[PDB]
């Protein structure tokens, strides 16, 4: 439920780069594929089960 985003999946470490203003990550089908943890900055890759 990252920052008010009710979703189910698997969270793993991601090496993708983020621009300083950029927070989320999106794909061709408007599905969130990356988030930044509000408490600690990190890169997480959401992958379905």
């Amino acid at each position: 439920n990252f920052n008010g985003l009710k979703g189910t999946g698997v969270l793993t470490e991601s090496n993708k780069k983020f621009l300083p203003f950029q927070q989320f990550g999106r794909d061709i089908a408007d599905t969130t594929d990356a988030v930044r943890d509000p408490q600690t900055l990190e890169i997480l890759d959401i992958t379905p089960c």
């Binding site: 993708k16 780069k17 983020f18 621009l19």
Partner: protein
């Protein structure tokens, strides 16, 4: 003083925007590499 002053070189440009539709190409890093207009030329 207020009357009498020498200033160095300086150049600037001012332009005006308008509502247009553009096509933007991203790269692997996530930085915009190219952009092309949609209402300028037939090829565009």
């Amino acid at each position: 003083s207020s009357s009498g002053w020498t200033a160095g070189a300086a150049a600037y440009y001012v332009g005006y925007l308008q509502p247009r539709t553009f096509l933007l190409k991203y790269n692997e890093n996530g930085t915009i590499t190219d952009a092309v207009d949609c209402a300028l030329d037939p090829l565009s």
